[PDB]
Every structure is written in C-alpha cells, then in structure tokens.
Amino acid sequence: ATLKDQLIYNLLKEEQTPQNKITVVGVGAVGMACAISILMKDLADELALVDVIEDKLKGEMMDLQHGSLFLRTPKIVSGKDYNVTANSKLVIITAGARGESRLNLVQRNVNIFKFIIPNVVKYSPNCKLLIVSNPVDILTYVAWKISGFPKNRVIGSGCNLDSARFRYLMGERLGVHPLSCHGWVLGEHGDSSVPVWSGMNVAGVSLKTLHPDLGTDKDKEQWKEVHKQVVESAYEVIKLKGYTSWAIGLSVADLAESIMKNLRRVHPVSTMIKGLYGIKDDVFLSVPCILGQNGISDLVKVTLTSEEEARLKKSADTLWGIQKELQF
Amino acid sequence: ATLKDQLIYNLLKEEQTPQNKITVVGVGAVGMACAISILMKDLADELALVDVIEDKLKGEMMDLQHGSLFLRTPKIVSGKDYNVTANSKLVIITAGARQQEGESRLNLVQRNVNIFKFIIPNVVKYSPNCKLLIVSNPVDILTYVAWKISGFPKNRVIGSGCNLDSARFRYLMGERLGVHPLSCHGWVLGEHGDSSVPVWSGMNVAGVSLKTLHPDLGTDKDKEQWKEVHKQVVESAYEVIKLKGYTSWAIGLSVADLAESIMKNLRRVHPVSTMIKGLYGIKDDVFLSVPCILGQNGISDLVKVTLTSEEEARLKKSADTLWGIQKELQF
Amino acid sequence: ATLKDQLIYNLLKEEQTPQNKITVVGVGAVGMACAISILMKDLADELALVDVIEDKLKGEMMDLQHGSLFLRTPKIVSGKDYNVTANSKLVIITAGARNLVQRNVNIFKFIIPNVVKYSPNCKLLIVSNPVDILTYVAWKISGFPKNRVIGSGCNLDSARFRYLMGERLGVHPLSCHGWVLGEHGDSSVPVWSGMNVAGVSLKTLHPDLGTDKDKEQWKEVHKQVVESAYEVIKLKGYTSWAIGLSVADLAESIMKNLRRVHPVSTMIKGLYGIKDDVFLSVPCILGQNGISDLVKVTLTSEEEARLKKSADTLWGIQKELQF
Amino acid sequence: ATLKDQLIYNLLKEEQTPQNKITVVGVGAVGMACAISILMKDLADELALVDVIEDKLKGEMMDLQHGSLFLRTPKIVSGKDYNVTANSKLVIITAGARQLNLVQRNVNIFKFIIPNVVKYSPNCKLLIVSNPVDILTYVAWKISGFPKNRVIGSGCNLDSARFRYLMGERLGVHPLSCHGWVLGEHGDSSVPVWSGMNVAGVSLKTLHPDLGTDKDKEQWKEVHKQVVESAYEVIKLKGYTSWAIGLSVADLAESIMKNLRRVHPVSTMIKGLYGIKDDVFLSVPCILGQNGISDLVKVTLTSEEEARLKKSADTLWGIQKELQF
Ligand SMILES: NC(=O)c1ccc[n+]([C@@H]2O[C@H](COP(=O)([O-])OP(=O)(O)OC[C@H]3O[C@@H](n4cnc5c(N)ncnc54)[C@H](O)[C@@H]3O)[C@@H](O)[C@H]2O)c1
Ligand SMILES: NC(=O)c1ccc[n+]([C@@H]2O[C@H](COP(=O)([O-])OP(=O)(O)OC[C@H]3O[C@@H](n4cnc5c(N)ncnc54)[C@H](O)[C@@H]3O)[C@@H](O)[C@H]2O)c1
Ligand SMILES: NC(=O)c1ccc[n+]([C@@H]2O[C@H](COP(=O)([O-])OP(=O)(O)OC[C@H]3O[C@@H](n4cnc5c(N)ncnc54)[C@H](O)[C@@H]3O)[C@@H](O)[C@H]2O)c1
Ligand SMILES: NC(=O)c1ccc[n+]([C@@H]2O[C@H](COP(=O)([O-])OP(=O)(O)OC[C@H]3O[C@@H](n4cnc5c(N)ncnc54)[C@H](O)[C@@H]3O)[C@@H](O)[C@H]2O)c1
Ligand SMILES: O=C1C[C@](c2ccsc2)(c2cccc(Nc3ccc(F)cc3)n2)NC(=O)[C@H]1Sc1ccccc1Cl
Ligand SMILES: O=C1C[C@](c2ccsc2)(c2cccc(Nc3ccc(F)cc3)n2)NC(=O)[C@H]1Sc1ccccc1Cl
Description:
Four copies of one chain form a homotetramer.
Chain A: H1 3-7, E1 8-10, E2 21-25, H2 29-40, E3 46-50, H3 54-65, E4 75-78, E5 90-93, H4 103-123, E6 128-131, H5 136-147, E7 154-156, H6 160-174, E8 181-187, E9 193-202, E10 205-206, H7 207-210, H8 224-241, H9 246-260, E11 265-272, E12 284-292, E13 295-300, H10 306-323
Parallel strand pairs in A: 2-3, 2-5, 3-4, 5-6, 6-7
Antiparallel strand pairs in A: 8-9, 9-10, 11-12, 12-13
Helix pairs in contact in A: 2-9, 4-5, 6-8
The complex binds nicotinamide-adenine-dinucleotide (4 copies) and the ligand O=C1C[C@](c2ccsc2)(c2cccc(Nc3ccc(F)cc3)n2)NC(=O)[C@H]1Sc1ccccc1Cl (2 copies).
Catalytic activity (chain D): (S)-lactate + NAD(+) = pyruvate + NADH + H(+)
Subcellular location (chain D): Cytoplasm
InterPro entries (chain D): L-lactate/malate_DH (IPR001557), L-lactate_DH (IPR011304), L-lactate_DH_AS (IPR018177), Lactate/malate_DH_C (IPR022383), Lactate/malate_DH_N (IPR001236), Lactate_DH/Glyco_Ohase_4_C (IPR015955), NAD(P)-bd_dom_sf (IPR036291)
C-alpha cells in the first residue's frame, strides 16, 4: 500500500515494445544535434543513445531526460551495450572523430563500424540505417556490406546538407525563403559534389533557360560561386567554431521525418548508383531518392550533362579504388 | 537586368522592422541550446546572437543559417556590436563563462556583475521595450543586477530561476509514478540551485494531494523517502556536470518554454525569479522564484503560495543571504 | 515505358501497411472536426473515413485530400465497407443521433463488429451520445478488454471548466487545474477539492467554493459547463470544434504513448460502491494500450453518492437494452 | 477580498494592443475552416470573428473558446461591430454564400465590410477568399485605397495545391516534392504551367514533350481538368468546399504573419505583364512577407498560356467596368 498503490490502480502490467523507436550511435556534437532535433520534431516514442565514453553518454541522456516535460518522447535510454537499442525503426550512425588525410580515416572508421553494425543488426534486424559518419559515401557501402541489409534499408546522409546549404545561399542571393529556392547538389559528398544547374529554379522557372551561361566559367553573375560557397562555408564553420552540429542535426531529423512518417518525399541521399551513368561497381552516391517507412523505396533518374555524368563516374571510380582494398 | 531582376519584379523595398525578434547574449552551451529550442518552436521571425568571441559567434550563426530550410525564422544575425539586437521583444542573457569547480558563488557573482555592467546598458540602448530573461548564474543575484542597471519595471526583468528545478522535479516525480511529467504537478520555489524549496502541499496527480494520501511525504519519517526526489534534483544537476561538464538541453528547453509564454502572451504560470519584496515577511530588494503569470508584459502577476512555517523560513534565509551579497555590490 | 517509369526507378513496390492508422466513423460535424484536428497534429500516416451516406463521405475525403500538401498524412481513404479500416491503431466512433440510446445501440450492433473484424488490436474511442452508455454498448459488443474501450467522457467538460476558470482568474486554461468527473453532461461532478492554480487549493483559500453560500458563485462555473453545451447547440445547431480538439488530445496520448492523465469514461465497477457494468469518467493514464492505469480520487460523501446515482441511472437503462 | 485577489497579486493591469491579430470575416464553412487551421498552426495571439448572423457567430466563437486548453491563442473574440477587429495584422474575407449576378451581390456586401475593416485596422493586410476571388480582390483594393501589396487574393494557391495532390497521386510521391504551378483566373479559366511541372528539378516537359498537349498518351491535361472538375465534384458530393481552402489560407497566413518570403500563386494587380494593360487581379507566383506582396516571379509563359491570361483579364474587366461602388 505505497503512495503509488494508494493513488494509481493498475489495469494491466502488459509491457509492450516501442512502436516508433530511434537510436543515435555517437553522442558527439553531430549526434546530440540529431538527438535534440528529433526530440523537438516529435518523431520517436523512445530514444536510445549509444557511445563508448560511458560518462559523456550518461550525462547527455540525463540532460535530455530533464527536458521531458517540454517533449513528447516518453522514454529516453542509453548505454555502452546495444541491448538498449532493441526494436529500433531507425538507427543513426554518427560515431567516429570529426592534418590527417581522407584514406587514413576510412579503415580507421571501418574498424569502428565492424563492431557497431553487427550489434545494431543483432538487437534491431529490421531497422533502416542512416549513416552520417564521414566519408558518408564510403561508410554507407561499409555498413551495407557488414549488415547484409537490402539497399533500401541502408541510407547515407550524403548531399542532403549540401543541397540545404545550396538552397540557403540561392535564397540569400534572390531574397526568397530556401523552401521556394529549388536546386540540387548530387554525387559525392564534400568537395566532389555536383551542382545540377538544369534543375535550379524558382516557381518552376528554370534559371538555366533565362541565364543560358548559368554555372559555367562564362557566367556574367558567376552563379558557380554559390556551389563554391557550399564547399567553402563548411570549411569556414570548422575554422570558426571547430565543428558542425546544428545544420547536420536539422537535415538528419528531416530525413528521419520522411522515414518515420512514411512521407514519400524526395531527398538527395546516398544510395547505390550501380547501373546508372555507366557505373557498374558497388558504390554509393547521392541522387534524389523517395524516402518512406522502408527507406529508399525508389530513386529519381536525373538527366545530367556529359560533364555532370563524368563527374559522378570519376567519384564512383575513386570510391571503388578505396573500397577494393578494404578488409571486411 | 541581372538574373534576380529578370526572374523577380519588385513592388517595394521599404520599412523592414522586426515584429517578433529574439536576442541570445552568449553563444556558449546554454546560449546555443536556447537558440535551437527557440528556432524549432517558431517563436521568432528574427534571431540575433551576441558574444565577445568573434570566431565562435560567426561560426554558430552560419551553422544555424545552413539549417534555414528546416526552420521558419527567416533571419539569423550575429555581431559583437549590439546594433544587431535592435527592436527585440525578448533578450536572453546566457553570457559569462560557466562556474568552474574551482571558483565559488561570490567569485561567479563579481565576475558576471562586471560582464552585465556592459551587457544590460547595451541591450537597453537598442531594445528599450524588450523583456529581459536572465539565465546566467547565480540567476537570482543577476536578475536583481539586471533590474538595477536597466531601470526597467519589475515585470520586464525575468530570471530563469526554478523553472528547471521544477522541470527536473516533475520528471523524477513522473519516473517514480509511471506518469508523464505534464500530468505530475509539483512546485520547487525560491533560490535556484542547492537552496531551492520543494512545496510538498502542491504535489498532485489529477488534483489528488500526495501529502493528504501519504502524510509522511517530505518528512524524514518517510519509509518511501520522497524527500529524496528534491535531493535528486540537486544531485542530478551536479552529476551532469561531473559526467558531461555542463548542462545545455534541459535549460535550453525550459527557457524556450518561457519564451513561448512571453512571445505568444499565453498567461501561463511558471516558477521564475521575480522581485519578492512584500511577500513572506521579506522587506529587501531580492529576486526569488514564485509562480508567475507570463505574457507580452513579462510578469503581469504572481501566485500567492501558502508556505509551511519551515518552507517560509527557507525563503526568508535565502532572501537574507542574497541581500547580504547584494548590499555590498558597486554600480 | 511511361513518364513515371522514365522519371522514377523503383527498388520495391510491395504495398507497405500503415504503422499509425486512425479511423473516424461518421463524417458529421464531430467526426470531421476530429479528423482535421488529428491531421493537423501529425498523429497518423493513414486516415480512414466511414459513413452510411456515400456522397458526403466521398466529398469529405476529397476535400481533405486536396489539402494534403499542407498536411503530413500521406494517405487518406474512405468507404462504406470497413475493409478500408484494416489494421487501425485507434478507431473513433462519432456516428449517431445529435430513444437517443435505442437507435444508436442498433447502429453499434453493425459498426462495432465490423471494426473488431478488420482491427482486432485497436483502441476504441467512443464520442457518440450518450457517450457513457455507448462505451458500455461498444465494450459489450466488441468483447475487448476495458483498457482498449474508451469514451470521450468528461475530457471536454474538464476543458470547458478550465476555460471558464481561466477566464475568471485571467490565467491560461493550461495553468488552471480542475476535474469534472462521472457522467458527461448534466450529471457531471466538479471535484472542488482538486481545483487549483500552481498547487494552491482554491477550496482552502475560499471555503465556500462549490456551495450555495458562495458569494462569488463559483458553483456557476460548473453549471456554465452544462449550460454552454446546450447554448452552443441552440446558437450554432451543434458542437464540433471543442470535441474535435479534445478527441485529438486523447488521440495524441494514445498514439505517442505519453502516459498523461485524462478524464475519460471507463469501467468504474469496483470503486465507490459501484457493482454494475457502468462506464463513468475518472482520471486515466492513456498510452499505446489505452487506459493502462486509473487515478483513485479521494472524493467527499456527496461526490461519491453522485457517481453511484449516475451508475444506478445508467444501468437502469443498460439492463433494458436488447443486444 | 475575492478569491482572485487572494490567489493572485497584480503587478500591472495591462493592456497592450494585439501583436499578432487575425480577423476572419464570415463564419461560414470556409471561414471556420480558416479559423481552426490558423488556431492549430499558432499564427495569432488574438482571433476575431465577424458575421451578420449573430446566433451562428456567438455559437462558433464559444465552440472555439471551449477548446482553448488545446490551443496556443489566448484570446478569441466575435461581434457584428468591427471594433472587435481593431489592430489586426491580417484580415481574411470569406463573406458571401457558396453560389454579374453573384458579383454585384458580393460587391454590395463588400461595400459595407471593407470601409469597416479599414477604420479599425488601416495598416492591415487584406486576404480575399470570397468568389469571384480575382474580381472581389480588385473590389476590396479600390474600396480600401490600400497599395496593391496589402491587397491579396487566395487565387490559385488551392488550384496549385489540388494540382500537386493529383500530380503526387499519379507518381506515388508526396505533393511537397511534386512541383506544379497553376496560374491566372481561379476556377474554370485556370492556366496550368507545364514548363514548370517537375520532380527533383527534372522537367516533366523535357522528358515527355507531349506533356499538356492533345497528343499526350498519358493525358496529363486531364490532371488540370481534374483540378477544376474536383471543385464541382466536392460541391455536388457535400454541398460546399471547406477543409482544403482553410488549410491553403492558413499557409498564406503563415507566410504573411511570419514574414517567410515564400512563393505562393496568389491573385495580384497584373497591369503591365503578359500584354495586360488593365487593372485586374490574376494569380502569379508572389513573395509573401510582413508587407504582403513585396515582389513577384516573372514566369516565362508560352504565347498560348499568355493569350489565356489576356482572355481572363478581358472577361474580368468586362465585369469590372459594369460595377457600381
Ligand atoms: N554526412 C554529413 O553530411 C556530415 C556532416 C557533418 C559531420 N559529419 C560527421 O559526423 C561525424 C562525427 O562528428 P562529431 O563532431 O560528432 O565528432 P565528435 O568527436 O564530437 O564525436 C564522435 C563520437 O563518436 C564516438 N565514437 C567513436 N568510436 C565509437 C564506437 N566504436 N562506438 C560508439 N561511439 C563511438 C566518440 O566517442 C565520440 O563521442 C564525423 O565523422 C563527421 O565527419 C557528417
Ligand atoms: N538558470 C539555470 O538554471 C542555468 C542552468 C545551466 C547553466 N546556467 C548558466 O548559464 C551560464 C552559461 O552557461 P554555459 O555552459 O553556456 O557557459 P559557456 O562558457 O559554455 O558559455 C558562455 C558564453 O558567454 C560568453 N561570454 C563571456 N563574456 C561575455 C560577454 N561580456 N558578452 C557576451 N558574451 C560573453 C562566452 O564567450 C561564452 O560563449 C552560466 O552562468 C551558467 O551557470 C544557468
Ligand atoms: N462525447 C461528446 O463530448 C460529444 C460532444 C458533441 C457531440 N457528441 C455526439 O456525437 C454524435 C454526432 O455528432 P454530429 O454533430 O457529427 O451529428 P451529425 O448528424 O452531423 O453526424 C452523424 C453522422 O453519422 C453518420 N452515421 C449515421 N449512422 C451511421 C452508421 N450506422 N455508420 C456510419 N456512419 C453513420 C451520419 O450519416 C452522419 O454523417 C452525436 O451523437 C452527438 O451527440 C458527443
Ligand atoms: N477562393 C477559393 O478557393 C474558394 C473556395 C471555396 C469557397 N470560396 C468562397 O468563399 C465564400 C464563402 O463560402 P462559404 O461556404 O463559407 O459560404 P457560407 O454560406 O457557408 O457562409 C458565408 C458567410 O458569409 C456571411 N456573410 C454574408 N454577408 C456578410 C456580411 N455583410 N458581413 C459578414 N459576413 C457576411 C454569411 O452570414 C455566412 O455566414 C463563397 O463566396 C465561396 O465562393 C472560395
Ligand atoms: O562533410 C562534412 C564534415 C565537415 C567537413 C569536411 C570537409 S570540410 C568540412 C567536418 C566536420 C567536422 C570536422 C571536420 N574536419 C576536417 C576539416 C577539413 C578537412 F580537410 C578534413 C577534416 N570536418 N563539415 C561539414 O560541414 C560537412 S558537409 C560539407 C563538407 C565539405 C564540403 C561541403 C559540405 Cl556540404
Ligand atoms: O544552476 C545551474 C548551473 C550548474 C550547477 C550549479 C550548481 S550544481 C550545477 C552548472 C553549470 C555549469 C557549470 C557548473 N559548475 C559548477 C557547479 C558547482 C560548483 F560549486 C562549481 C562549479 N555548474 N548546472 C545546472 O544544471 C544548473 S541547475 C541546478 C543546480 C544545482 C542544483 C539544482 C539545480 Cl536545478
């Protein structure tokens, strides 16, 4: 006859599995920004956090739990052991560590993924994996290989942020909200991204039709500088604050909304492009994909120029060059 | 002319005054948590950021701007100069470094008072009709400091106070009962932090007084040890500092809740630090948390809580202690 | 090859099922208000609409569908056949007469079996009046465990009370706490004991609260809750917005498994000396399994007698019903 | 002392003018759908409702007020007198009755409303929903004396939303990712812009040159025919349209109230574009901010699409010239 017993009469002890659970692996700057954005978008009924730094993991879990009054996510759990991640609909991988080269980081992150992915598959075999950790294009393949999951359930963040940055920069130039400034950045994430000028428009008005020299070395207004700013801005943010968190966190939560709510919205995400643009290797690049409750259900076939297809093909060859030497 | 001129025809390029602007002073862990929580709640049509560290300031602003597509705040500005804060409806002060395990309360006071001596006048200059929401610690002491420097009426000088303390309390209360913190009512008042007062009489679930059902609630004679719920509020705060070095998300979410009541003129009750001269035998200019009605004018009214002799004494002790520090402050 | 096949390359087409399906039965004023409220709150990935009038049903579905760009619900279906309601998490019954019992029992004789058929693990949410009797009618026919059979009850009555309380105190209803229990409508019970703002008891500050002795006439606040229902019906012809919003609020707690306390009509048999199978409003913890738990309110001898009276009156009607 | 005084200590007894006030004129099915959507989107701090039928008006005000606990708009008001509408940022006109005859009928109604709206909210943005929207936006503009930026019509925002829903249903994609612009005269004379129809920036006309032509194998012209055919179908099936228009008005209200600077196909003064030299209000993509229509998107139209806008303008002016104010 405790206070709970005097106040509450129990009708059932029938404990059930979470219906719309999400897991964030890596409680670093990126992962925590993904965690807060998801929590504030009301996408999960349960949020699980995983990391190797036990103390930092407990602290972040508690800090999010103390905001439970202001949230609509009734359960916030964490732990080093992946048993906490059981029955997750979506698993977001952000684990890693932000002079070093890009090749040095690959096998370094592959060894990390060699533990995470099996443990994720163990407790959540029917989940959708959203890979954020860089190189995202390579690590999405790495995860797809180790998991043995079909292509659709292995999604890479890719150029979702690149396009968001593009649409914002396009928006500032024209003085219009990014929501109404349409433009697509595809292929390899980072420096090797492809700005698809043909699709760059405002209210169905192709900016290439009005300005035929758009995104060329000829261009009077030099619109190619907008894409140059997409790569520059990212480097600038690291030079100014040392890392990125908010923008990536928001972009990930948008992808989470499409998947969790089965919206069938189009996003520039990393999927296997094998069979397209003369690519025959098992490589992942960003193309606009249809995101639903089972991940990439479909992908949009973008008509590109010979110069744009070659850019994707070069990226595809370079990524496979690193992939064929990888140990699994 | 140019692509912009060929694509878009202009009807006017006039006025451009902010209707629902918010400023965040101090782009640290707490300041940035307030910012993201505010942006994701669609409370501002303009967000401004201020800080002494130019690099971090520019970096944080850009990181927010790059996420614009997933937000409804069409303008994010930042600067060391306070011209960027002009016409704010609400200014949040999260400036000044967090308390070092080495430094004490009095050391944190003196340091943050010197900081405020230049923040508050500059905030007032560009936003003379704004609401000041003080977060920087010791929140109670600094809400008084802000009030004195600004020359603003009591209503427009609000301190975060016990909003977080009560939020932690309702979470813990909910965890024990298997109920959502929204349905678990409990108020933590007075001095924010270690000296906070849990009001056991107001502890309820669906109007049912927990103290009426369980008279031993709050007392040391409690077999269920419910007094540990308030001890855990204090313990958890210290624990998060030991575990991750600071607190950001919890305070960021509670400040956004306060901002929501102000910006939308909701008139919801919140445990926030306000001028308590006239209540509980207090005769000095001390700012302690009591349930306040928050709207477009900040604190329009406050709720008179029936405290027990013991609960009253703790409020009086904090008032006597805080006035002791405040009476020896140079302006 | 079509323009679709040329634009979109498919990976998988096997029609995936909804994970958060909600069904609304009766596309009347109430049903449609529930629908829009549920849609504007992003609670469903699929919305199902059922009505005997096929023309109004098709139009209501179409009108909602044309606003899909502003909503986050990718699929909105409708039909006379309950096959369109297959695998719903929550089913809302708003179908019925705006004697009032007799016809609605005959309606539920067809509705309830057809719902259970296509959605056996769903939570039933009864709105149709007399809500307290029809929740029993729905529970009786379904054979569902009492936790999965919920009635709107006094959630709206408590909403109206907190609005009036708020208007009187100049405070938002969110910060004005008060509970209206028992029967929905006239026989409802205001729990003055629990009526508060910021934990401060109004009955402690104003002992006359609820009595006829009361100079401030706070007993009128509860009478106004009853008055307003009839008043809106007289002025407008019916009530829709308020019930729609309250139903969506319950839907949010059930769908998101929040575990928030709500005054909803439940099997109160076992408490307050009640022995008959009657559904009356008491504070309930709502989640993914419906009413998982119940809040035992400390009631006065007057309040407790009012619920037993409600129980005896309702059962008196319930025993005379033919199933 | 009263219970209120014993419980609450006052610091200042207010009162400030409403900061984000919205007014809805006409508490019919359209206006009440605009009301619930605005409320559920947290766009206003004050909502004012105005109508001639006092009984319906008080009943609707009370119903919304009873759900205040589930809303974030602390003040809902109503009245026959326009004093309840004072200091509004946006005033929405939905006054009329479902359906030259209907024009002059609604002109006479507007002849009273607009002056009363201007008297209490002279700095407000006017949003016209009442049909014929393109003609009644002109009527309101001339009566108000407001500059063209503060006089907006719902126009083809709903026509585009319907097009995007149908487009999305065909392709199995969300209407958010299906982009299509329906411009000009709202209703029967609406103009679909095929050159702008796209998914992920991929022009559907470029891949399928038969798009929007008679020789179309997939008959995409029927998508636009279904846009206008849907309106009549809903009218025939349930007697009126409410939910779809309410949501689209809330969308416009969001862009205005939050100064988003988003692009919407709304009815505006088109004198000077596509060979139109008359004072007519036609739908084109507009930037919607705090000052209403600040700018507009100059859509590249084919001579057939251009001629259709001219034909709309000619028919509208024919009606507009025969009106008495
Ligand atoms: N795809 C994109 O668009 C995009 C954008 C920005 C950042 N990123 C990437 O996000 C990643 C992380 O960034 P960050 O700022 O959060 O780094 P961080 O150093 O702040 O945090 C990384 C976390 O990973 C954890 N971790 C390392 N090994 C682990 C393991 N075996 N198991 C569990 N956790 C482990 C660390 O403990 C650490 O907490 C980087 O790789 C970065 O490149 C991707
Ligand atoms: N009221 C509460 O419940 C509560 C909860 C947690 C933290 N806090 C308080 O919030 C404050 C900050 O927390 P933090 O973790 O973000 O510290 P922080 O060191 O991470 O950030 C502080 C920021 O203030 C900036 N700053 C310093 N001097 C400044 C000046 N003169 N003008 C403008 N900006 C200046 C710093 O550059 C820094 O960005 C602390 O005082 C802390 O105690 C209050
Ligand atoms: N619980 C509450 O708080 C509350 C509040 C207000 C109204 N109500 C009740 O809700 C009910 C309906 O309200 P209303 O205003 O929408 O009335 P309404 O007449 O406008 O709507 C009733 C609808 O039910 C349909 N219907 C009738 N029989 C049906 C059947 N066998 N299957 C499917 N659909 C059927 C009708 O065609 C009609 O569309 C009434 O009983 C009313 O009293 C309850
Ligand atoms: N632009 C669009 O996309 C679109 C779509 C659908 C409907 N509509 C239009 O919206 C209008 C209204 O639709 P409805 O179904 O709500 O009509 P309704 O019959 O349901 O009610 C209209 C209201 O206008 C009121 N009204 C009449 N004269 C008034 C006056 N002088 N002052 C204040 N109120 C007055 C009536 O009293 C009535 O309540 C119609 O003209 C209709 O054509 C526009
Ligand atoms: O991919 C990342 C990680 C990175 C980054 C990577 C290359 S430049 C910036 C990031 C985050 C945290 C640490 C680092 N470290 C780092 C910086 C420069 C470098 F050359 C190697 C490592 N980088 N920051 C980012 O915002 C994103 S998006 C991005 C990056 C480049 C071009 C265009 C875009 Cl849309
Ligand atoms: O007031 C703060 C700042 C603080 C803090 C202060 C005292 S214990 C924790 C915080 C933030 C950043 C740094 C520090 N460090 C610090 C703490 C105590 C000390 F003595 C020296 C340094 N503290 N963290 C917090 O969560 C909040 S809320 C809180 C604090 C104590 C009890 C109950 C509550 Cl709801």
